[PDB]
Design a protein around this ligand. Structure first.
Ligand SMILES: Nc1ncnc2c1ncn2[C@@H]1O[C@H](COP(=O)(O)OP(=O)(O)OP(O)(O)=S)[C@@H](O)[C@H]1O
Ligand SMILES: Nc1ncnc2c1ncn2[C@@H]1O[C@H](COP(=O)(O)OP(=O)(O)O)[C@@H](O)[C@H]1O
Ligand SMILES: [Mg+2]
Ligand SMILES: [Mg+2]
Lengths: 200, 97, 137, 484, 275, 173, 96, 195
């Protein structure tokens, strides 16, 4: 019918869904399916033009209520179905973007070519919105922090990537590669999340 | 392979290159064997393994032989004025072994 | 300066990537010569895919797609050049085809020279593997 | 017993074994297993005194190729190793990793290793609604001069592939390659016993010394290679078995060396029918190049003087190679997980390339006035399709893009078009050479359009370029007398 | 109970039940001016070209009427088709289609079939313990078709049997003290290759085929197929084959292997128009 | 039945056998004849998102025929051996479509069968989800049963198996 | 009871000998010189090392194998080119 | 989104351990923070009672929140007292209760699995009974309770369910299955009752 392109789109969205589910490879959203989006959007334009063509032909012509109502109704239903497929695909991409932003606000701010201009702007402003939340009133708690409960206060860590020297709250950490620390889990959480320290 | 006269099923028995495994196989008058008999030692002389897939018996025997063959030039006399390939009827795949 | 700009190579599908060492660090590599015209063709093709279809809606068929077709009409975007045999032709990333320039009506508001990328239109003929161009702009 | 464990000059010895309950239907013929059993004794009544037939009662079987079917016709891959395979498939250089790990001791032969990777992965099988099915296995033929390591490649493929059978062309019969009708000694009833092409079902069969097969034995492979079914009508049996095997056959042109002086059809004694099945027909040649000979010698010496056992291990641990036990699992996973299908843009490229290939073959046949020994047919278009799908499969990509099409086209041009392009009127050639030698001076150049005006295909210019007396320099628009 | 599912359709009998609606539709379609063209072109949609071979195959599927004349005369009503041509011209895919479509088809190959295996084998019964005949691959196909692929590869000793069958449509057995005459009223469709690799138009169509004329005379139609290298036809065939290779089954995702379970046995037993 | 639920979106886009009731003019855009209209009493396969609406608005335009996936043969198969039924081949979204059909037609008998089917199959998928492989240094039955689950049960199994695996990993850490 | 090893060797000499053998095989010759004839030098050197019951192939056991292989190659050539081939290969059999 | 998929409607077992760690437990201190009649920093916490911490006397049993008892047990500065239900006699009594009443669960505390795991890992030397036997009885109780659960998940109707005396970890691991099968059997029922 008319939703076959939309059906393929939501099938690909399902793939992205399970794709990113897969444990936690924090996979990058498969590059936007621009080509399928363009075709279905063009498919919508043809349907809208058909409604415009039928409506003007109904006025000048002698068209009974039956066909004038039914053809318009079917075209409207097809357009709604295409809208739903597009909306589902976009909403899944938006949800994955939100998850990535929340998890990586403490990890990294990143290939970004997989995102359309609208999605790039959305992510760029969403990071700012998250930072606004982390500073308005809930500044005492780190709203972007880890959601795993803080079981043990003191942990030992191993430096993966050399980072020279980094100043902590009171003293300083000399992040010599392949050197093991024994420090409080509080002041190394960001480094562990980023990917500089490894153990626990 | 042969049909065992007592048990009546196909069984595999080795030949010269298996009876001479990890030894030497001596082939006198190399150039006078039939071509379709001389080509049968191509695998056992380089890969040192006889591959048999006849009568439902798919197996690869082992023949770590060392062929020493005595040949005889075309016409009975070695013509020193001609290259080696023109003095024998053997081809490159068997001369390279 | 010409030596201090940003290397912008266009990923053929849809991307304008960024690329950004010794005494002979300025010497171009062979692949640079290979892709010198490919990048230019990709840029012109993107320009056409943005302007022509939204303004004029015949599609652009790659030259390799003209082989089995006998007398159909095609719109080719190719680099006008002279074959080693001495006859004009269009070069495309997918291939090349000789063009019969006789009985052609060109847009008079342009300079047409070998090496310029043109938009020819005509009927392919498999009898001699030639593209009888009608209007090229 | 293992062929590498039999004593000197001894036949392999069988041993009856019994499974029970959950250890049944666990292995298939041809698989290598390690058994933990009780070496027991039973007195079968079927010729000495007080003799007892020995057997082993199995208490545990530890195959290395999965259970009946492959992974029991499904996926029995632990989650950690499945995640490892997924991580591997995302490697941007996975193709180079797989190529570099196919017979690491064989120097060069990059194209053959790539084709072997494609053969191991295989295409995607299709079953259309109307009933006819399209095979998804790649057959590769390796013609060429002796000493080019074809048999070593075949022996390695017999190891890396999860299911493989190695057979020689000489010692192999038609009834022993496909299916042998045998008479049961007890019940007097005929029954089939599978051959090499049935044991290697779902895998690859390596037929070394292909050209030595008897003419009536090589024909039996014709159906089992394309239709992938074996039809038997013997002794009151009428069955159509299945053999979904890829055939990797190594052959030898007549006269041993290629002998390019002779016609390309004279070197190859295979019929057109048999040659059409093979997807890629490699014709390798001994270059006799000094700079390459030094490299080959230095590589082989390193192989001999123990340096391989260190260099290969270091490369494998570096991540630029894959061990056999890991590539085998990856191949099984890819074959049971992904079956890519072509994108429309890929299909357009494949069609437009098939037309070009057939046009080139037509013009070569017209020039030579003799049918080409190497055929190009619709089966070769399906060959390019299968190569594309295998290239996509090794990356676990569900859809084959134009990158895979470009690489499959390159592989086909490097193997079958190269095999078919081999070339050995004469008066016209002599006249052209003489007239251009006398007219065009020794040190100057003339443009080719001018030579065309003077006048054809003009292979004389290419022949002269071989003799280094002329030289096409300005992108083929200038013919320059190089100095001879 | 014995439930005869057949016809390779996995759940229906060889004699498929005909509903009154189906018979009405069949009669309606029989009135079309070009019913023959529709039925022929609908045979093997995946095989581009070969329209005349498809028409001949369809005519063979419903063979002519068989005349049991007096004085022992017997005019066979079965059509035999031989297809000889260049490699990879769908000579064997057409045979496979006939196997998958005909109500009773038996697959045979030149190499993998002997005369005993094609006519009758004198084996011994085990339940009773006595000599008995076992029907061969071409007596089992009685009132059916036999798809002999790679026809020319049959050995001469194994080719006299099919010669006799196509001659008089009965095999005769005179071994092990058995004198019977089994009935083999089958229509043979065979695919053969030229004597050389490919068909040679410079020679008569006798030295191209490696079969005796006394055997080619029993084939109603001898179709010669040539893989002529064109440019328009090559483009058409390539497009058709690529369309075929992109086919995706209904209940399957893209890039998912086509696993087969065939567990359609949800129940055991019976449980104008111009297309 | 969420709007953005991809499982529901895909379930909606499944063809259903339905005969027409009016000689409707001008339709059939992709129904084999774009310009030419659709005749009355014509049997056609339509997506559920279309046939559902077309079977209520109006005598309704389209009459919905009993699909094969709910035929008496499938019902007998369900009532016979619910665990050993290859419901993935019958329909990858069998349960969502069954729920939609019950909602549309208020079928108090199809629901009473599909609920028992769901319970009986839930027992077995819990058995398979709560059995975790232990390394001494996947089962055949588990892998051959996981091939016979729809897209709904394949998510319940994934969630429950992940929960059991997390509990095991925490307890034995 | 002996399996000599090729640890101490000059792979450059063997590589040069093999390259020269192939170059003279392709032009003015007919004896096929493949990689098998490169491995033949190593195998003959190992046999010579076995003769002395040595567990390591010495330089003498390699020079002798090279001499054996080049002599077998040269003596099978036509008498017209045999003198030139012997003169060309003399630099590898220095010492005997 | 903000909350990951695996944390949607359930608790990760780490969060269950976090919840359990807030319950008070009885300890034998190895230090003494009780200021004498004749400086020092007091705990002055905000989510629990600091009174029992500023008044610790060595080898005088007090009650502190579990996550603090573990923190002190990280050093040698306390000794966690096993709860009375975590002895061989009481575990045998509970096992006998389970084997005697095949329709209802035993009255084990809601945190018995989590507490047993935590105490076995961090306080392995504070049990009056051999820990190799306490583990073997905890596992037996878990097995019996798993058998009873699998035979009650056979009563997953669409109205309700009474899982009396079930622990917290067992409920947490059964939540995504029970609460998603009952949802489907309820959706089917409501679809049928659309009249
Ligand atoms: N490129 C190479 N790299 C490494 N070893 C090689 C190479 N080429 C040849 N060899 C060696 O040379 C020998 C070649 O023997 P095989 O490969 O078994 O015979 P073949 O190459 O198949 O030639 P045939 O079978 O007589 S036509 C083996 O010992 C190989 O290890
Ligand atoms: N006319 C055609 N149309 C479509 N496919 C064809 C055609 N001819 C050959 N093929 C393809 O060639 C492949 C092999 O054909 P095959 O049956 O082996 O022919 P033959 O038996 O004569 O070699 C088939 O997979 C088929 O798809
Ligand atoms: Mg070999
Ligand atoms: Mg055929």
């Amino acid at each position: 019918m008319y939703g076959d392109l939309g059906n393929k789109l939501v099938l690909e969205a399902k793939r992205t869904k399970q794709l990113y589910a897969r444990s936690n490879q924090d996979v990058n959203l498969p590059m936007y399916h621009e080509d399928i989006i363009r075709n279905i959007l063009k498919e919508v334009s043809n349907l809208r033009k058909n409604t415009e063509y039928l409506k003007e032909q109904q006025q000048l012509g002698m068209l009974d209520d039956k066909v004038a109502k039914c053809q318009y109704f079917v075209t409207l239903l097809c357009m709604e179905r295409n809208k739903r497929c597009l909306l589902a695909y976009q909403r899944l991409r938006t949800d994955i973007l939100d998850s990535m932003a929340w998890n990586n606000n403490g990890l990294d701010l990143m290939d970004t070519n997989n995102l359309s201009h609208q999605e790039q702007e959305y992510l760029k402003e969403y990071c700012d919105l998250i930072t606004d939340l982390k500073s308005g009133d809930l500044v005492d708690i780190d709203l972007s922090g880890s959601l795993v409960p803080p079981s043990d206060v003191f942990i030992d860590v191993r430096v993966l990537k050399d980072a020279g020297e980094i100043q902590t709250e009171y003293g300083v950490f000399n992040l010599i590669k392949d050197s093991q620390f024994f420090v409080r889990q509080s002041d190394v959480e960001r480094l562990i999340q980023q990917g500089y320290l490894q153990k626990i | 392979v042969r049909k065992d006269p007592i048990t009546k099923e196909w069984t595999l028995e080795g030949g010269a290159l298996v009876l001479a495994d990890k030894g030497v196989c001596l082939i006198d008058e190399f150039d006078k064997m039939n071509d379709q008999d001389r080509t049968s030692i191509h695998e056992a002389m380089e890969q040192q393994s006889i591959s048999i897939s006849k009568a439902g018996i798919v197996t690869t025997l082992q023949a770590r032989c060392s062929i020493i063959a005595a040949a005889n030039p075309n016409g009975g006399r070695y013509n020193s004025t001609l290259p080696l390939a023109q003095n024998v009827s053997l081809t490159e795949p068997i001369l390279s072994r | 300066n010409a030596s201090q700009q940003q290397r912008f190579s266009y990923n053929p599908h849809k991307m304008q990537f960024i690329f950004v060492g010794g005494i002979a660090g300025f010497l171009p590599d062979i692949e640079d010569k290979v892709q010198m015209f490919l990048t230019r063709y990709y840029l012109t093709n993107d320009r056409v895919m943005r302007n022509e279809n939204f303004q004029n809606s015949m599609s652009i068929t790659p030259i390799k797609n003209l082989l089995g077709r006998d007398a159909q009409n095609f719109l080719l975007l190719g680099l006008l050049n002279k074959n080693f045999k001495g006859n004009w032709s269009l070069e495309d990333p997918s291939g090349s085809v000789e063009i019969d320039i006789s009985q052609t009506i060109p847009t008079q508001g342009h300079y047409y020279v070998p090496g310029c990328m043109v938009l020819v239109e005509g009927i392919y003929y498999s009898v001699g593997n030639k593209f009888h161009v009608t209007s090229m702009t | 017993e293992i062929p590498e464990l039999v004593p000197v000059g001894e036949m392999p010895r069988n041993l009856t074994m019994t499974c029970d309950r959950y250890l049944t239907n666990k292995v298939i013929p041809g698989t290598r297993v390690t058994i933990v059993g009780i070496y027991s004794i039973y007195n079968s009544k079927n010729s000495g005194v007080a003799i007892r037939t020995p057997y082993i009662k199995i208490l545990g079987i530890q195959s290395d190729v999965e259970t009946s079917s492959i992974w029991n016709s499904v996926t029995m891959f632990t989650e950690e190793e499945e995640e490892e395979f997924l991580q591997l498939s995302r490697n941007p250089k996975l193709y180079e990793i797989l190529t570099n790990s196919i017979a690491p001791s064989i120097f060069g032969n990059e194209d053959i290793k790539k084709a072997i990777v494609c053969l191991l992965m295989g295409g995607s099988k299709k079953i259309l609604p109307d009933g006819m099915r399209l095979r998804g296995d790649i057959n590769v033929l390796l013609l060429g001069d002796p000493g080019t390591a074809k048999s070593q490649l075949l022996k390695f493929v017999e190891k890396v592939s999860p299911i493989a059978v190695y057979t020689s062309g000489k010692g192999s019969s038609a009834a022993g390659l496909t299916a042998s009708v045998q008479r049961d000694p007890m019940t007097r009833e005929f029954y089939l016993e599978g051959g090499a092409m049935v044991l290697a079902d779902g895998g690859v069969v390596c037929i070394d010394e292909f050209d030595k097969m008897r003419d009536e034995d090589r024909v039996a492979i014709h159906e089992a290679m394309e239709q992938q079914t074996i039809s038997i009508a013997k002794a009151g049996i009428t069955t159509v078995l299945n053999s979904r095997t890829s055939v990797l056959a190594a052959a030898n042109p007549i006269y041993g060396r290629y002998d390019d002086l002779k016609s390309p059809g004279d070197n190859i004694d295979f019929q057109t029918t048999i040659l059409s099945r093979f997807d890629m027909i490699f014709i390798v040649k001994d270059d006799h190049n000094e700079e390459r000979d030094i490299s080959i010698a230095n590589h082989v010496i390193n192989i001999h003087t123990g340096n391989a056992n260190a260099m290969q291990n270091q490369q494998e641990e570096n991540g630029s190679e894959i061990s056999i036990e890991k590539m085998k699992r990856y191949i099984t996973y890819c074959r049971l997980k992904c079956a890519p299908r072509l994108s429309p843009q890929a299909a357009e490229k494949l069609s437009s390339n098939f037309v070009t290939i057939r046009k080139q073959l037509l013009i070569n046949e017209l020039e030579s006035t003799e049918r080409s020994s190497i055929p190009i047919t619709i089966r070769q278009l399906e060959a390019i399709i299968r190569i594309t799908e295998s290239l996509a499969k090794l990356e676990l990509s569900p859809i084959a893009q134009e990158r895979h099409v470009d690489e499959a086209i390159r592989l086909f041009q490097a193997s079958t078009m190269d095999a078919a392009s081999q070339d050995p009127s004469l008066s016209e050639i002599r006249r052209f050479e003489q007239e251009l030698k006398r007219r065009l001076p020794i040190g100057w150049s003339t443009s080719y359009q001018t030579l065309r005006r003077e006048f054809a295909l003009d292979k004389a210019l290419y022949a002269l370029e071989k003799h280094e007396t002329i030289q096409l320099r300005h992108q083929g628009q200038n013919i320059y007398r190089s100095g001879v | 109970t014995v439930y005869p599912l057949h016809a390779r359709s996995t759940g229906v009998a060889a004699r498929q039940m005909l509903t009154d609606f189906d018979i009405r539709n069949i009669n309606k379609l029989s009135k079309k001016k070009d019913i023959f063209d529709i039925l022929s072109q609908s045979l093997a949609p995946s095989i581009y070209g070969h329209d005349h071979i498809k028409k001949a195959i369809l005519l063979m599927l419903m063979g002519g009427v068989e005349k049991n004349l007096e004085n022992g005369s017997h005019l066979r009503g079965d059509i035999n088709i031989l297809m000889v041509g260049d490699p990879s011209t769908a000579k064997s895919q057409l045979l496979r289609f006939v196997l998958n479509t005909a109500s009773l088809a038996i697959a045979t190959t030149g190499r993998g079939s002997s005369g005993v295996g094609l006519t009758a084998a004198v084996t011994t019964d085990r339940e009773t313990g006595e000599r008995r005949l076992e029907a061969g691959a071409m007596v089992l196909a009685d009132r059916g078709v036999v798809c002999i692929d790679e026809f020319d590869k049959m050995t001469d000793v194994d080719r006299v049997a099919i010669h006799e069958v196509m001659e008089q449509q009965t095999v005769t057995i005179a071994k092990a003290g058995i004198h019977t005459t089994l009935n083999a009223r089958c229509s043979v469709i065979a695919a053969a290759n030229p004597v050389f690799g490919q068909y040679d138009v410079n020679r008569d169509p006798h030295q191209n085929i490696a079969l005796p004329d006394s055997l080619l005379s029993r084939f109603d139609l001898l179709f010669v197929v040539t893989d002529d290298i064109n440019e328009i036809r090559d483009r058409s065939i390539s497009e058709h084959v690529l369309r075929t290779h992109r086919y995706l089954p209904p209940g399957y995702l893209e890039g998912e292997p086509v696993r087969e379970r065939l567990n359609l046995s949800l129940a055991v037993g019976e449980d104008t128009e111009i297309p | 039945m969420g709007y953005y639920d991809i499982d529901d979106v895909l379930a909606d886009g499944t063809e259903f056998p339905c005969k027409f009731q009016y000689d409707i003019p001008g339709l059939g855009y992709l129904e084999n004849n774009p310009g030419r209209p659709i005749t009355k009493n014509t049997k056609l396969s339509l997506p559920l998102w279309l046939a559902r609406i077309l079977a209520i608005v109006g005598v309704p335009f389209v009459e919905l025929l009993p699909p094969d996936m709910f035929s008496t043969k499938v019902m007998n198969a369900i009532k016979t051996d619910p665990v050993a039924l290859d419901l993935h081949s019958i329909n990858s979204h069998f349960f969502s479509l069954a729920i939609k059909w019950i909602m549309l037609f208020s079928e108090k008998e199809l629901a009473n069968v599909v609920s028992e089917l769901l319970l009986q199959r839930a027992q077995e998928l819990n058995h398979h989800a709560s059995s975790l492989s232990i390394d001494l240094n996947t089962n055949i039955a588990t892998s051959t049963f996981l091939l016979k689950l729809e897209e709904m049960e394949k998510e319940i199994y994934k969630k429950s198996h992940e929960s059991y695996k997390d509990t095991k990993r925490w307890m034995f850490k | 009871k002996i399996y000599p090893k090729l640890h101490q060797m000059d792979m450059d000499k063997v590589s040069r000998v093999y390259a020269d053998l192939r170059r003279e095989s392709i032009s003015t010759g007919s004896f096929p010189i493949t990689v098998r004839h490169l491995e033949s030098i190593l195998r003959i050197a190992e046999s010579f090392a076995k003769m002395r019951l040595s567990e390591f192939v010495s330089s003498y056991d390699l020079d002798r194998a090279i001499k054996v292989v080049v002599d077998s190659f040269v003596d099978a050539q036509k008498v017209s080119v045999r003198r030139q081939l012997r003169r060309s290969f003399a630099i590898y059999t220095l010492g005997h | 989104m903000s909350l990951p998929a695996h944390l949607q409607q359930t608790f990760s077992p780490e969060e269950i351990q976090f919840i359990v760690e807030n319950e008070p437990i009885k300890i034998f201190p190895r230090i003494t923070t009780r200021q004498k009649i004749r400086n020092h920093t007091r705990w002055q916490l905000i989510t629990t009672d600091d009174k029992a911490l500023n008044n610790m006397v060595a080898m005088r049993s007090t009650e502190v929140v579990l996550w603090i008892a573990l923190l002190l047990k990280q050093q040698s500065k306390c000794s966690i007292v096993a709860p009375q239900w975590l002895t061989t006699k009481e575990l045998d009594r509970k096992i006998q209760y389970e084997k005697t009443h095949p329709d209802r669960f035993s009255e084990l505390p809601w945190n018995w699995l989590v507490l047993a795991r935590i105490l076995f890992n961090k306080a392995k030397d504070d049990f009056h009974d051999p820990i190799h036997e306490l583990r073997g009885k905890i596992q037996d109780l878990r097995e019996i309770r798993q058998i009873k659960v699998l035979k009650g998940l056979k009563y997953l109707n669409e109205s309700h369910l009474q899982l009396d005396n079930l622990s917290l970890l067992e409920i947490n691991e059964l939540r995504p299955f029970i609460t998603e099968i009952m949802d489907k059997l309820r959706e089917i029922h409501t679809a049928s009752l659309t009249a």
